């Protein structure tokens, strides 16, 4: 994985370049954003369980998904589902702190579409639940931080489909 | 079932089923009709079992249907009664199969995560299973009731 | 129609039971003396 700083450093190293003006700007921009990232991250962790609870309630409750024959039916599957939503929120928060989605490509999306097609997990319902997580988190962290989480949660959604 | 429980146990030891394992499979198949009768009784009386259990539960736990409670309001009460019917349908799976495998894999594995996320108090779900057990054990002979109780009690023990 | 597991199938049962909610309790942390009221078995 790489954060915003090491992305700049590694791309400079590949080109054999000292950090020029454009690189310094990108580093300054991440440093300025740093305070708002740690604040949003601290908020999300305090509300992680409640965020997923609300997102499930508003996207995946009292539908055919949770009824017999739905992919969330049975307690073990319900638990596996909300466990999955917890994954996306936590890793999306990692990416938000890092200012870089690479951790998502590496530790979340690798093999995920294949795994869901194997187990029959409905991706459409999953992306809906992630979208609901995006709405709920934005209400708690704010508008600016909400958009930042929105970027990375959308990144997961687009990697699923 | 009791058959899959034994097979999985022997397979993990790279061995054929022991005499004892075959003994209890033989007994299970011999007493099959008694299990199907107990299962037939619960299915037919499910509506009265859940209602009378639902009624008994809320009188012992009036809080859960009070403001702030998980089953507060008629619509949540309907959801709670639905959950009782789920676990009633699973007890009948246990009896016919002679093993609690259908109960565990459908209704107990990970259940604490599900009810924690929903905020449902788990000890109150267990209580509703007691109530169904009592209403059920009065609709059949003691021997039939005793066999049915063992599977009700398994759920009560695991949820508690 | 309603499918299996749909909580609508128990709305009629829920109304028949008509469970009695506890009355809004009369409690106030202001009136409670914590150190004096906590049991001391």
């Amino acid at each position: 994985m790489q954060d915003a700083i090491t992305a700049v450093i590694n791309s400079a190293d590949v080109q054999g370049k000292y950090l020029d003006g454009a690189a310094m700007d990108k580093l300054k921009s991440y440093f300025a954003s740093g305070e708002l990232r740690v604040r949003a991250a601290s908020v999300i962790s305090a509300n992680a369980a409640t965020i997923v609870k609300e997102a499930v309630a508003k996207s995946l409750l009292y539908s055919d998904v949770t009824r017999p024959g739905g992919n969330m039916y049975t307690t073990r599957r319900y638990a596996a589902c909300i466990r999955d939503l917890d994954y996306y929120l936590r890793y999306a928060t990692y990416a938000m702190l890092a200012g870089d989605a690479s951790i998502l490509d590496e530790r979340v999306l690798n093999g995920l579409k294949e795994t869901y097609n194997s187990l029959g997990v409905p991706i459409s319902s999953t992306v809906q639940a992630i979208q609901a997580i995006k709405e709920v988190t934005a209400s708690l962290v704010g508008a600016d931080a909400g958009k930042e989480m929105g970027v990375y949660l959308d990144y997961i959604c687009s990697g699923l489909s | 079932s009791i058959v899959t429980k034994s097979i999985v146990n022997a397979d993990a030891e790279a061995r054929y089923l022991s005499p004892g394992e075959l003994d209890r499979i033989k007994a299970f198949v011999t007493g099959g009709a008694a299990r199907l009768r107990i299962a037939e009784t619960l299915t037919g009386s499910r509506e009265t079992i859940v209602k009378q259990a639902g009624d008994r539960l809320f009188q012992k736990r009036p809080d859960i249907v009070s403001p702030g409670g998980n089953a507060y309001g008629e619509e949540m009460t309907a959801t709670c009664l639905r959950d009782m019917d789920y676990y009633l349908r699973l007890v009948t799976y246990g009896v016919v199969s002679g093993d609690v495998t259908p109960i565990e894999e459908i209704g107990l594995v990970g259940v604490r995560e599900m009810y924690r996320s929903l905020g449902t108090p788990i000890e109150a779900v267990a209580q509703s299973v007691r109530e169904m057990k009592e209403v059920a054990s009065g609709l059949m002979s003691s021997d039939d009731a005793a066999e049915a109780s063992a599977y009700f009690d398994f759920v009560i023990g695991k949820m508690s | 129609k309603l499918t299996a597991g749909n909580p609508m199938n128990f709305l009629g049962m829920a109304r028949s039971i008509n469970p009695a909610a506890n009355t809004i309790p009369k409690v106030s942390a202001q009136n409670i003396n914590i150190e004096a009221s906590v049991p001391r078995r």
């Binding site: 309630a57 508003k58 996207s59 409750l61 009292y62 539908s63 | 403001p67 702030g68 507060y72 309001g73 619509e75 949540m76 309907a78 959801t79 | 909580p7 609508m8 709305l11």
Partner: peptide, 10 residues
Amino acid sequence: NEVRRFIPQE
């Protein structure tokens, strides 16, 4: 005090 519903949100 809220009253939760059993209908799917739209």
